[PDB]
Every structure is written in C-alpha cells, then in structure tokens.
C-alpha cells in the first residue's frame, strides 16, 4: 500500500492554484489510514484524481472539474459524480449498484454491470444506451439526445426521459410506477401503457401523439371504470 501515499504526494504537487489538492490529499490519507468505506472529494475544484483507495464502497466526487476518472476500485457500490465535465466513464466495477453522473458531457456509457439498480445520467450528451441490466430499478436520462431506448428490465419502477428525441417507446413492464416522457417525438404509445397499476403515473405531454392515439386515450382514461394509470397528455 506503499505506492498510494506518494502517488498522492506527487499528485498534490502537479496541479493548478485553483485546485484544493491539499484538502483532497488529507481526505484521501485519512480515508486510507482508517480503511474507511466512503471517500468524499466533493467541491474541491479538482481537475484530475489520482489512483483511488482500493477498499471504498462509496465515491462522492460531485462538483469538480474532472473530464475523466481513474480506474474505479473493484468494490464500489455507489458513485456520486454529478456536476463535472466527464466526457466518458471507465469500466464499471461489477459491484456497482448506483451511478450518478448527472450534469456532465458523456457521449456514450460503458457496459452496465449486472447489479446496477440506479442509473442517473441527466444532462449529458448520450445518443444511445447500452442494454439495460436486469436489476435496474431507476433510469434517469432526461435532457440528452437519445434517438431510441433499449428494452426495459422487469423491475424498473422509475423512468425519466424528458427532452430527448425518442420516436418509439418499448413495451412497459408492470414494475413501472412513474414514467416521465415529455418533449420527445412519440407519435403512439405501446398498449402495455394501459396495463400499469392504478397508482402509476405517466406523462407524455409535449409529444406529437397522433389523433387516433389521443382519441383512444381520452376514450379510455375517462371511461367509467378506468383502472389504469393517470396519463397526462396535452392537446
């Protein structure tokens, strides 16, 4: 573990004046010496990060100036990277459960590991997604440039895709409780939308839904015994 303390001391010496590499160094040092689970380097204006302590399960590094990350330690379960300048992500560790990279510049994601449950990548530049893994519970990708979206795994409960360019929506799994679809290019909805739970919520405002689609929906959602989700669609 002899490398780390000195790759950190050289890292501390090779930055710019705005970066708070000293506060960072101290936090890294205390985290390693005490073998802590969480590393918090947030809000230190850091432009790079060095090799990370290998035992951490949570990495919280939001609000820095990072364009890339070093390799991710193989036991991380939670990463908070919002508000950076990331152009990409390294290979994601198989332990990973939550990826929060909102407000970055990411053009494509790497492979999504099999245990991932929460993927939050709003305000990026993603044009396509990898296949969504089967344990996924939450997907936030609003404000990207997505032309299409992959099939949804059957435990997905929250889906947010406002302000994309999606033209066709894959069938929705019964797990789905909250689906934000505004300001896309949808012209129809999959019939699965009507089979979701009564407490579920679906927003399709700001989509060019066809006339036959709108008539169908107003016919059903106002019908006497309608027990499907609340569907918001404007005219």
């Amino acid at each position: 573990n002899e490398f780390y303390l000195k790759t950190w001391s050289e890292w501390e010496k090779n930055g710019t004046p705005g970066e708070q590499r000293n506060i960072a160094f101290n936090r890294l040092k205390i985290c390693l010496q005490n073998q802590e689970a969480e590393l918090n380097l947030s809000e230190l204006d850091l432009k790079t990060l060095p090799d990370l302590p290998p035992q951490i399960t949570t990495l919280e590094i939001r609000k820095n100036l990072l364009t890339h990350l070093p390799d991710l330690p193989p036991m991380l379960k939670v990463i908070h990277a919002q508000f950076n300048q990331l152009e990409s992500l390294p290979a994601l560790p198989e332990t990973l459960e939550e990826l929060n990279a909102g407000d970055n510049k990411i053009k494509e994601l790497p492979f999504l590991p099999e245990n991932l449950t929460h993927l939050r990548v709003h305000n990026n530049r993603l044009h396509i997604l990898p296949l969504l893994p089967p344990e996924l519970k939450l997907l936030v990708v609003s404000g990207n440039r997505l032309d299409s979206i992959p099939p949804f795994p059957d435990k997905l409960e929250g889906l947010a895709l406002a302000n994309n360019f999606i033209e066709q929506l894959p069938e929705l799994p019964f797990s789905m409780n909250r689906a934000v679809l505004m300001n896309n290019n949808l012209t129809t909805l999959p019939e699965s939308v009507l089979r979701l739970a009564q407490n579920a919520f679906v927003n399709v405002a700001g989509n060019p839904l066809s006339g036959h689609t709108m008539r169908t929906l107003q016919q059903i959602t106002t019908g006497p015994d309608y027990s499907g989700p609340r569907i918001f669609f404007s005219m």
């Binding site: 929060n100 909102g102 709003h122 406002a162 405002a205 918001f232």
Partner: protein, 93 residues
Amino acid sequence: EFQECAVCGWALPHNRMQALTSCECTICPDCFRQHFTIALKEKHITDMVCPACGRPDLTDDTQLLSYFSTLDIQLRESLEPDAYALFHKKLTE
C-alpha cells in the same frame, strides 16, 4: 434525515431539500437552480414545470398565476438576482 434528489440522486436532509407544491418530488437545491435558471434564460415559462415529474399541467390558465405565486418564494431564495428579476420580467410578459 436524508432524502434523495429526484433528478440527480443526491441525498440531503429534507430540511435542506426543495419541494414543489402541486407535485411530490424532492429536488436538490442545485438541480432546482440550474433547471429553472436554464428554463428562464433559454426556454419559455411554460417549460418551467417540475424537472422530476413534468407537472402541473400548464397551458391551462386557471393554474398559471397560482403556480408562479407559490413557486416565487423559493425562486427568490434560490436564484441568483439577475435570474430572479428576469423571472419577474418574463412573467408580466
């Protein structure tokens, strides 16, 4: 204790978070500021709905004045001054 931002996924004490009336989504002060500052400067006011759920239904005039009157107090605390005064400017227009 700790509650998760509906958009960015970051946890803050609920006392510190920001809720929106006519909706039930909690937003971190950061995503609340950036979304409404960007809507006020590069979009129109009707796009100034909840970033998490898309509610309230705008374009319906009965709710417009009442939505913005409630949201004003947290915009006053939340936004930088130039964006708060622009929000008032974009509202009387």
